[PDB]
Design a protein around this ligand. Structure first.
Ligand SMILES: Nc1ncnc2c1ncn2[C@@H]1O[C@H](COP(=O)(O)OP(=O)(O)NP(=O)(O)O)[C@@H](O)[C@H]1O
Ligand SMILES: Nc1ncnc2c1ncn2[C@@H]1O[C@H](COP(=O)(O)OP(=O)(O)NP(=O)(O)O)[C@@H](O)[C@H]1O
Ligand SMILES: [Mn+2]
Ligand SMILES: [Mn+2]
Lengths: 180, 179
């Protein structure tokens, strides 16, 4: 830990950015930030901004549903978006979690069958992790930003990123950064 | 009798980039984008060598060794991005790295040595006048150099431009006509 700085140097600029993205996409979202005092290498702080912003925009765009939809679906009217940082052994863990509609895994499945990557029979055997990983295959999604770009930036930092989601329950993206 | 995906050009690069970076002991995350982008089939064989040369330049002269990336406060692993797309009536091909960038001082020194410029004119050269020296035929040592890349690009009736910032990186853009 030579050049450690609180992750607040990258976090504090998000509340305003989230609020304006919500207004633009007509989404009502309660934004929560946890662990802004978590220390990490300054190089990361200066490079993780683009990535996080993209995960936050994804949550607001594809995740949280318009209030009128959440209401019709029987969910808390206002959406919740949580950006947090914490320590797990010699790793700094940053997470972006929403209680939105969740990643549409069938949509992914159909796209993979369409690109000839898998056939029907095979698609019925895939695990959620295998499905969600298609989101990291370059060129898989239609646009440059994207999950492709988030994984590459994160890994150029010797970091790791994972995803998990449950239909109508929400989505959570996890980024692990190394202790320097 | 016309278009084919640029993948016929891009396919062999990952392996050559991995092998190249490994030989010069550089950490490189190679990213290829838009390989489905189409271009005239008569460009395939001619744009290959020039493109490989730009990647080799990035790995060799661009991306710095780990300890050097670390001292500069940069991501440990260098990023080399090759991308193709259709913008207008042409195909756009970009080769960008987040390395140390082109040593402009060194280019000016070579320019003077090659009689391309007097030293009295070096002090006020713009970054574009400097970088353009690389396009002057006979500038590079030997083989292919930036001068040969520009010539091949010209023979395809397209254009090329360079952009570079010290310690930030270099981006080479090639625009080729579609029809
Ligand atoms: N938080 C989320 N909640 C629900 N779906 C998500 C979320 N994040 C991503 N997705 C889905 O995953 C697919 C890909 O995300 P991504 O690679 O960021 O692409 P993009 O949003 O489609 N377009 P681009 O704007 O070019 O990145 C999205 O298109 C959504 O279908
Ligand atoms: N991506 C780059 N990053 C930093 N410097 C670069 C890059 N590309 C080129 N250069 C510099 O620009 C000068 C010329 O490149 P070029 O015209 O390709 O010649 P070359 O290096 O002499 N040929 P070779 O030895 O055949 O690879 C180089 O000598 C480098 O110092
Ligand atoms: Mn996106
Ligand atoms: Mn060279």
């Amino acid at each position: 830990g030579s050049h450690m700085v609180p992750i607040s140097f990258v976090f504090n600029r998000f509340p305003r950015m989230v609020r304006d993205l919500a207004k633009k996409m007509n989404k009502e979202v309660n934004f929560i930030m946890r662990g802004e005092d978590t220390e990490l290498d300054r190089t990361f702080v200066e490079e993780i901004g683009e990535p996080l912003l993209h995960l936050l925009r994804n949550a607001i765009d594809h995740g949280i549903e318009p209030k009128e939809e959440r209401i019709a679906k029987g969910k808390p009217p206002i959406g919740t978006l949580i950006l947090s940082a914490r320590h797990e052994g010699n790793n700094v863990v940053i997470e972006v979690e929403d209680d939105g509609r969740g990643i549409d895994k069938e949509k992914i499945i159909r796209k993979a069958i369409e690109k000839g990557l898998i056939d029907e029979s095979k698609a019925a055997t895939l695990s959620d992790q295998e499905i969600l990983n298609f989101l990291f295959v370059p060129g898989f999604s239609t646009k440059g930003v994207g999950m492709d770009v988030v994984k590459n930036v994160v890994e150029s930092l010797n970091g790791s990123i994972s995803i998990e989601s449950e239909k109508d329950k929400g989505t959570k993206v996890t980024i692990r950064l190394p202790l320097t």
